[PDB]
Amino acid sequence: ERNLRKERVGVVSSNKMDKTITVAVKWKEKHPIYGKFVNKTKKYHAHDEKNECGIGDTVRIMETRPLSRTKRWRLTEIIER
Amino acid sequence: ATKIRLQRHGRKGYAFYKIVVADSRAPRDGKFIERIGSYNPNTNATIDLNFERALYWIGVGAQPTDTARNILSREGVLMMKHLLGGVKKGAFDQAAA
């Protein structure tokens, strides 16, 4: 009977750093003024206990407490390689 | 502490008070946690009051001012003595008098 934390599904964009990865989340949303639908992307930093993620992977990450200067997410699953 | 008090929300020469639950440090007419009624001393004094919420706040321990204590003494809000299960289980009816 707990609360729920934020979850983000994304694509791995960098893994050159030890025990941490970068996840890119992209979505299409409506422009406020002209009403066109444009693409936007955001980059998250996630903590992975093993360097088991290569460049490009549909993954899910979950919100955590600050684990570093810029590290607030943790890996949960790998949808595909 | 959490208090039950009146904010002057009216016009010059016509005082109309709002009965709210607010911190003691907040300004008189500023911030409050919950509105629990109204009060008008100009008539012969009309009082609006949320009985359930007033009971809840006086139970969790909000301290009322003197005038708000009199307003709660009216409308029978201080019946917590009777509702404390004082060696009984029924509910008396003193509102008719």
């Binding site: 422009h31 003024i33 002209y34 066109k36 444009v38 | -």
Partner: protein, 120 residues
Amino acid sequence: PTIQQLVRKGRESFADKSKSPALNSCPQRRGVCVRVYTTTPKPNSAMRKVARVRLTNSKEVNAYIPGEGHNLQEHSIVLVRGGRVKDLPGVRYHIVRGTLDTAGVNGRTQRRSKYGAKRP
């Protein structure tokens, strides 16, 4: 333009200039009569009385003197308001009559409040 062109660039809106920039968004200013002279209109052929005044906002401008008969002179403190004269290039301000050194028009019985004359 196309929708994507508008998304990339957008629309730009300019700012309308103020017709009385020396007032610095004030109704009236105070000045001193640096010079009092006369000018000729640009098909009128009159002799219009003007004063060059240095306002307290660190600016010098030319102010017309409306009415017939002015008691002003050089080095006189005057109140300057907006309003330009069509047939006179340059000047774009008026001097309020009946305020500070400027006196009201003598012998006025109509339009008195526009020239600072009291009820007779």
